[PDB]
Design an enzyme around this catalytic site. Structure first.
Site, PDB file in Angstrom:
ATOM      1  N   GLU A 160      23.376 -22.720 -25.736  1.00  0.00           N
ATOM      2  CA  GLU A 160      22.517 -23.353 -26.731  1.00  0.00           C
ATOM      3  C   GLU A 160      23.183 -23.375 -28.089  1.00  0.00           C
ATOM      4  OE1 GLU A 160      19.084 -24.655 -25.851  1.00  0.00           O
ATOM      5  OE2 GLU A 160      20.456 -24.596 -24.140  1.00  0.00           O
ATOM      6  N   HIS A 188      14.958 -38.764 -11.210  1.00  0.00           N
ATOM      7  CA  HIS A 188      15.671 -39.655 -12.112  1.00  0.00           C
ATOM      8  C   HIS A 188      15.512 -41.108 -11.726  1.00  0.00           C
ATOM      9  CE1 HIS A 188      17.574 -35.759 -12.936  1.00  0.00           C
ATOM     10  NE2 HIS A 188      17.810 -36.254 -14.138  1.00  0.00           N
TER      11      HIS A 188
END
Ligand SMILES: [Zn+2]
EC number: 3.4.17.23
Lengths: 596, 191
Positions: free
Chosen positions: A357, A487
């Site tokens: 992150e 997706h």
């Protein structure tokens, strides 16, 4: 007043207005994520709507300005982005019909429930139940019911919508001058620059094919090894030569081979290193974990985290009333505000997650100087790749020993190294064939190479040929197996994942060379090398101002994608695999069917 | 003759940069000792003078200029450094400098919803000459013939600054006072 003088003034003010509204929308989203309540949803929606409306007006204004006339590359790139206007061209009711189709398919996927054949009463939703069953079950019967059930309910409902789905998408693409929806999708990789940095959509497809042929041997050896290990758990079910059954792979769609690892460990006795309890012994806390991650970045030479980020970011799960979204995310709110929202527990995995992150946040900081239109990663793949390499170096034992969580006495051994490599291979090598074929089929369908009557037939044949996966039970044309994946249902391209994997390995190899690590690629750590950090920084700074080919060249010296670093990383494992698979057969036969 | 410099140093409201206020403080004596001691100023630079000798130096017809700019804009207020706001909002003569004081005042001037009161001018025809004030709100257009509302290529010249509490330090509001010293124009009002 010349053509570009008019263009620059327009772009000038567009940027100012955009910055303010983008910030307001971002703040509303953050508020909703941190505390989940109904009016937070309402406020979020209102802010988003205004931002979108503003963008549309600007795009229309931009299009009535000749682009060829502009003689400055920087300005042209910015005007180009505003001018795309893809869905504006389609008719309003055509517009409305398409929107309805999209909403319907999303809802069907989310609410789909598959009911157990043996127990009519038991019905399982995919999100909290079906995946768990597929994940844990070792029973052939149970895995089969789950696979078929999701297939039957969702796929059949989705297919009529999907067909209408395809036709209109193709229509807008041609209105926008793209040949088909597929190259509309392929456009992002395409770049134009004067001194050989030119890229075209046609070229991308060829490059993908070349890379795939090269990684083909490694995959087949892995397939054979997995073949033998599963033979022990399911002797009757899998005939060696034959392709693996789809349901048994451990994921509903078979994307990842990660969960097969307990069955496939090369050495059972030796344990993979875990420093979690060591953190517990030393009373590590979430703030402590983040501080250590920041230190790693400082030693490589990238800037340390901002004053503000530490205060506003939610580094811990909120107590009591507040309801939060569990998924860790990195937020670039805008206006100098960078935040990370995650719930941190003391675990080895979390230490690694924190590093990843942080990497995303650093790039965000790097491209801030660039203009609002150009404030982004050069290509879909680059941003994810930058975050990934940082995690890899943190994971190496030497880094842990320096931290002190790992004892100095501990020495890594050959057995552990092989175990680590195989685990990595299952996640990385396994995903690429699936990704390639999925995109392969979609592109062909959009152009119309595949007729509608043969859509499912082609899809299954391709799976046998490329991924060595065979359907457990035969499927009719009415079934729509590609649509079941999230997706595809939500219209997201998957080409990005394939590209990212290639990019990350190249970056790592180059950085290790600057650091002058001697030894295996898996062993290398980039920690404490100022020079490696510096060159990474130069690439991060450019953002989207110059093409992706140029950016890749700056760090690795090569304009194009190269699959060789990936092979070097997995080379020690490959030699071991070859010896195990020397006796057993290598390859698969498409003919074998479980149903037969 | 000593008069407190505190009240223009601290005020409920400081004006926007385009309408920079000019203050004539003459016959007002400031020790200047507190200037050096307090760290209230994040940035204190005197391009014109060393300032070691400021206390002894006799001051004639001193001027105070007060405006609010964001933190990034503070460096623009320097010799040269034309940029945008120096070019269009406040112009500093390169030859003549005094002392520039800049302090963050995020809590007073920024709030969660945001403060849009302050303004800056981003579009102008021509360049501001040293110490010149443009207050006009023309409709604007590079071709002349200004079109007041939605026609192409005509835009208003003034933009709100939009300070917010959550923003980064460069974005955070800074209150800046520039004192300009006229050397020997008249016998020194301050000694
Ligand atoms: Zn990521």
């Amino acid at each position: 007043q010349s053509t570009e003088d008019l263009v620059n003034t327009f772009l000038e003010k567009f940027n100012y207005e955009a910055e303010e509204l983008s910030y307001q929308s971002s703040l509303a989203s953050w508020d909703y994520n941190t505390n989940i309540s109904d009016e937070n949803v309402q406020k979020m929606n209102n802010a988003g709507a205004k931002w979108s409306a503003f963008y549309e007006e600007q795009s229309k204004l931009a299009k009535t300005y000749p682009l060829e006339e502009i003689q400055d590359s920087t300005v042209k790139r910015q005007l180009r982005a505003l001018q795309h206007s893809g869905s504006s061209v389609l008719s309003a009711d055509k517009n409305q019909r398409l929107n309805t189709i999209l909403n319907s398919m999303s809802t069907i996927y989310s609410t789909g429930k598959a009911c157990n054949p043996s127990n009519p009463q038991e019905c399982l939703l995919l999100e909290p139940g079906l995946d768990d069953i597929m994940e844990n079950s070792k029973d052939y019967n149970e895995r089969l019911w789950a696979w078929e059930g999701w297939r039957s309910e969702v796929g059949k409902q989705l297919r009529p919508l999907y067909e209408e789905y395809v036709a209109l998408k193709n229509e807008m693409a041609r209105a926008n001058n793209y040949e088909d929806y597929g190259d509309y999708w392929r456009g992002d990789y395409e770049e134009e620059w004067e001194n050989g940095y030119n890229y075209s959509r046609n070229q991308l497809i060829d490059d993908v094919e070349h890379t795939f042929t090269q990684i083909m041997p490694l995959y087949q050896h892995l397939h054979a090894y997995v073949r033998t290990k599963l033979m022990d758990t399911y002797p009757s079910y899998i005939s060696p030569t034959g392709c693996l059954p789809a349901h048994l792979l451990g994921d509903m769609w078979g994307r990842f081979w990660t969960n097969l690892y307990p069955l496939t460990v090369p050495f059972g006795q030796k344990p993979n290193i875990d420093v979690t309890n060591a953190m517990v012994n030393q009373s590590w806390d979430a703030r402590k974990i983040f501080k250590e991650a920041e230190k790693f970045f400082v030693s490589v030479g990238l800037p340390n985290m901002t004053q503000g980020f530490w205060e506003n970011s939610m580094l811990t799960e909120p107590s009591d009333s507040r309801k939060v979204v569990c998924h860790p995310t990195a937020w670039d709110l805008g206006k100098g505000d960078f935040r990370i929202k995650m719930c941190t527990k003391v675990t080895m995995d979390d230490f690694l997650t924190a590093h990843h992150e942080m990497g995303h946040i650093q790039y965000d900081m790097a491209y801030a100087a660039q203009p609002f239109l150009l404030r982004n990663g050069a290509n879909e793949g680059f941003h994810e790749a930058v975050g990934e390499i940082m995690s890899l170096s943190a994971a190496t034992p030497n880094h842990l020993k320096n931290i002190g969580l790992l004892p100095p006495s501990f020495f890594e051994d050959s057995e552990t190294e092989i175990n680590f490599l195989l685990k990595q291979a299952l996640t990385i090598v396994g995903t690429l064939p699936f990704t390639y074929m999925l995109e392969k089929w979609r592109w062909m369908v959009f152009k119309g190479e595949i007729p509608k009557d043969q859509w499912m037939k082609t899809w299954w044949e391709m799976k046998r040929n490329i991924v060595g996966v065979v359907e457990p039970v035969p499927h009719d044309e009415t079934y729509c197996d590609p649509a079941s994946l999230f997706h595809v249902a939500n219209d997201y391209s998957f080409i990005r994942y394939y590209t990212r994997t290639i990019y990350q390995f190249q970056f790592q190899e180059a950085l290790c060379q600057i650091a002058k690590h001697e030894g295996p690629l898996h062993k290398c750590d980039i920690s404490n090398s100022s020079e490696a950090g510096q060159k990474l920084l130069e690439m991060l700074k450019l953002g989207k101002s110059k093409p992706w080919t140029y950016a890749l060249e700056i760090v690795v010296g090569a304009k194009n994608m190269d699959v060789r670093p990936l092979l070097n990383y997995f080379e020690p494992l490959f030699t071991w695999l070859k010896e195990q698979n020397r006796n057993s057969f290598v390859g698969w036969n498409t003919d074998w069917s479980p149903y037969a | 003759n000593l008069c407190p410099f505190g009240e223009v140093f601290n005020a409920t409201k400081f004006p926007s940069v385009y309408a920079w206020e000019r203050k004539k403080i003459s016959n007002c004596v400031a020790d200047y000792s507190v200037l050096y001691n307090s760290t209230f100023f994040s940035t204190f630079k005197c391009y014109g003078v060393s300032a070691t000798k400021l206390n002894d130096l006799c001051f004639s017809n001193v001027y105070a200029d007060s405006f609010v700019v964001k933190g990034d804009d503070v460096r623009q207020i320097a010799p040269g450094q034309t940029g945008v706001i120096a070019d269009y909002n406040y112009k500093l003569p390169d030859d003549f400098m005094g002392c520039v004081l800049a302090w963050n005042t995020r809590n007073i001037d920024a709030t969660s919803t945001g403060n849009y009161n302050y303004k800056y001018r981003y579009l102008r025809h021509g360049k501001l000459r040293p110490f010149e004030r443009d207050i006009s709100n023309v409709p604007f257009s590079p071709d002349g013939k200004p079109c007041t509302p939605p026609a192409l290529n005509c835009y208003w010249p003034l933009n709100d600054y939009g300070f917010y509490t959550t923003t980064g330090i460069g974005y955070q509001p800074y209150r800046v006072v520039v004192l300009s010293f006229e050397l020997l124009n008249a016998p020194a009002t301050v000694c």
